[PDB]
């Protein structure tokens, strides 16, 4: 649209120039006009649209139908929308006229060769930005955005189904391209984070893709081995980190090098912009696909129970140093493919890998919230939850490189949580998310010593104060309620959880009606918190199915009081509760229906 | 919006610390009494108690009525004033039944109020009325706010005039602070790019400023050595680069560590956010302050002429321009000129970047283009052709300039030149009408036209280089010279179109200065002294004297450039350089008001 190029003509000899199919050319004179010039005419061959326009005013007016009065502020604009078949097969002639001489005072001839040069990719502009207004040099976020998407499989076999396509259309006379260079280039910065293979030869061969744009390879002269269309495959090599915005740009430049005694000069430049697909976490509220477990010779009942739960949930089960402590499952998305990526600090053919080593703990310190709205901002991919450490602590629970990575994804702005009060220190010990039909589409389950205190008091006042826990050393409800140290420590734990409750309500925009307090007691090991009875909140969420650790609570009228309380709290929301014996894992999930490129961060 | 939950027990009194601003939700830990139907809430003077449904907003006073018991009701406690002694305030929740006259049970919460606030200069004079300022955010634009942090050196006698102040107000009972920690902290990332010195003792002493937040020092327990106010001085250590957004954050955290058998727990956190002041270039259209020259045993007339020009322009003269640029960093309390390299230090900062293995850099006056507004102008970088082996501008410098983010740069085509500087063909002069300036471009076509006009007027035999000499006719009839200058004109036309597009310039904003060229080694050098490569001191212009044709006793090229530049109020002086850097005043526009 806005591209225009100046080409000057000489009265003493013809000029010859190359023009691009889209770009319009300003045709001015190099030197004085004839002596008594008062008027001028412009003529052109079929296919060269000529227009007159004041240089101050917008709007074009046709030129080849009238003799115009000479004005220095008038611009002649030439457009060739169609490429040329032979060099200089079109021309323009400016004739200068006086009111006295019948014949023209002087001719100025400009022969033109039209070439069509275009570098394009998959811009992902279905219904987001009305095309023909897409600045190819930009990548725009939001539902009104556009731009190329680039995936990253690992941070030379047949694995190009994840690479992005890049088409270089160069339609023009062949002879022109033994005089003019076509340089595909990229910055030294972008070269270290992505590579480009040009296909040269049969498409079926695996080594026909030549490594043309690499780590030190920042420029490459493109040979037109396939006529007027060359194909490149772009492979992303780095995820966005603290020092990488995620944008990768490639340019094509046409270089006039015809003048042997002069220097080469640019004629045209086209650009495509790829953004690296961020790594997105999957909350518990998403549908599962494959559960991954690691078992031993004695853990043969937990696996049977989790397999039964996966069967009832439609999910599939696979068996396999921990898959839930040193390993996280997320996904990268692109219009043509969604690839699950593992983050580490084997499990599938369609699986990518990413890792960051510290520059100098466990991944239970990382969770993710369902989509929320808070502080006016909308988080349609949810927010990451990072259990940090208290200011001034010696040990660090999450390395700085992982924090930088998660913040550089920026599609799930993280929230720090207080977990130093726990023995292990995982957020799943006190926090969970389950699907709910009404409300915000889910419920946030928080461990609550206060809820268990209230329930035990209610059961004691109902005469069942002597019911025993750990029935299937046992302890009664009365002995727990009368243990002053236990109750006071659980009040402290309740306040610790209240801090996180307020933080989560503020940052996730949650209301009290969105929270459910699961009764859960704790004890001290060692000056930190561990579960008194098996942690009910640290459950497994497979859609509407819940694998809840069996608490072995008091037995009243032949039913576990804690199991029945958790049923009373969770079943009216459509979930089916299963209590798994773990006293005697990771889930891969489906991507969000919301596309991350539609988000405006 | 901050709120903190504190639970009370029916069997024993609870005790808590509350922050002056924050409101506390007071709930019960455990069941309510047996036949509870109503409740009352009472508090000491200075403890505002409110009742509110947990689903609905809006508070209602609490200590004037007996309410019906509802689990969804929240009791909110506010203590806007600090306490003098521990637990000098208290709240009492009494539970009532319609049968027992006396309350069923009391729940007592003793409260001690402390006031903790970490503040800096938020720069919110008339942009945001400070009641909506999120201290955890730094917002660009004319409706923005946030702390500014300057950088004096990017590679302790009296250099605290450039550091930013940071006040920690901690007003409360002294005993409280032998049980609770005050931790001032920052990330390991930000710690490597800024430092913080706590002042402890007399202001006149040089070693009273203790290095408390450093490169590996990411946390520091603050002693209340001055009562209820501690002072810290923050010094920025790094400019924004490709891997640094320029934001530095410091937090204060109150840690309850009273429970010996339990773990420490957070109570309150406050934050201040500093942004590093970007490095801003100064275009030729800004008023000069001090010209800097480097001389030799010869060239004593050029220096005298430059001194006369500086004198007539009000500027000062002191005794380069390559591998060295002069810009400025700005903050509401100080503007410091910073030199970027690849005499002394009176109010002068320093920055350098070594490659990972400056005539090529200029800057435009403020412009508007493509809908965007560039009130600090745009940087102009003469780059290299894509297929060229050598690089004229290193990648680290490009990353630095793009990270400054306040003058988005524009690449220019300069490989056709022998040296390759943008000032060889490009200049900016102030103009009264139109926009704030005119863009001077070297034009072989203009000189061709002028020589043709002078030849048709009979003066075709006037000789250049008179005061080796060549006539107008010999130049016009030199076919190789004219063709090469046409090529040079097209090379400059490429840059003209790029500049018009990226700077939003019109043809009426451009002036073509007649300038011929010749070939040194396949590249371009000035035929006669380059007229466009001039010195701009306000309305005064030091133009390299062209030894062109003399017609009627006056140089036709000098008179042509006068005809072109004097009707704009400029005064032209032609200095003999055939036989420098300028420090300028900052933009009136403040960079923090820009929205990039």
Curated annotation (Swiss-Prot), chain B:
<dbReference type="GO" id="GO:0042802">
    <property type="term" value="F:identical protein binding"/>
</dbReference>
<dbReference type="InterPro" id="IPR038685">
    <property type="entry name" value="PAD_N_sf"/>
</dbReference>
<dbReference type="GO" id="GO:0005634">
    <property type="term" value="C:nucleus"/>
</dbReference>
<dbReference type="GO" id="GO:0005654">
    <property type="term" value="C:nucleoplasm"/>
</dbReference>
<dbReference type="InterPro" id="IPR004303">
    <property type="entry name" value="PAD"/>
</dbReference>
<keyword id="KW-0225">Disease variant</keyword>
<dbReference type="Pfam" id="PF08526">
    <property type="entry name" value="PAD_N"/>
</dbReference>
<dbReference type="GO" id="GO:0005829">
    <property type="term" value="C:cytosol"/>
</dbReference>
<dbReference type="InterPro" id="IPR008972">
    <property type="entry name" value="Cupredoxin"/>
</dbReference>
<keyword id="KW-0106">Calcium</keyword>
<dbReference type="GO" id="GO:0005509">
    <property type="term" value="F:calcium ion binding"/>
</dbReference>
<comment type="similarity">
    <text>Belongs to the protein arginine deiminase family.</text>
</comment>
<keyword id="KW-0378">Hydrolase</keyword>
<dbReference type="Pfam" id="PF08527">
    <property type="entry name" value="PAD_M"/>
</dbReference>
<dbReference type="GO" id="GO:0043231">
    <property type="term" value="C:intracellular membrane-bounded organelle"/>
</dbReference>
<keyword id="KW-0963">Cytoplasm</keyword>
<comment type="function">
    <text>Catalyzes the deimination of arginine residues of proteins.</text>
</comment>
<dbReference type="InterPro" id="IPR013530">
    <property type="entry name" value="PAD_C"/>
</dbReference>
<dbReference type="GO" id="GO:0005737">
    <property type="term" value="C:cytoplasm"/>
</dbReference>
<dbReference type="InterPro" id="IPR013732">
    <property type="entry name" value="PAD_N"/>
</dbReference>
<protein>
    <recommendedName>
        <fullName>Protein-arginine deiminase type-3</fullName>
        <ecNumber>3.5.3.15</ecNumber>
    </recommendedName>
</protein>
<dbReference type="GO" id="GO:0004668">
    <property type="term" value="F:protein-arginine deiminase activity"/>
</dbReference>
<dbReference type="InterPro" id="IPR013733">
    <property type="entry name" value="Prot_Arg_deaminase_cen_dom"/>
</dbReference>
<dbReference type="Pfam" id="PF03068">
    <property type="entry name" value="PAD"/>
</dbReference>
<dbReference type="InterPro" id="IPR036556">
    <property type="entry name" value="PAD_central_sf"/>
</dbReference>
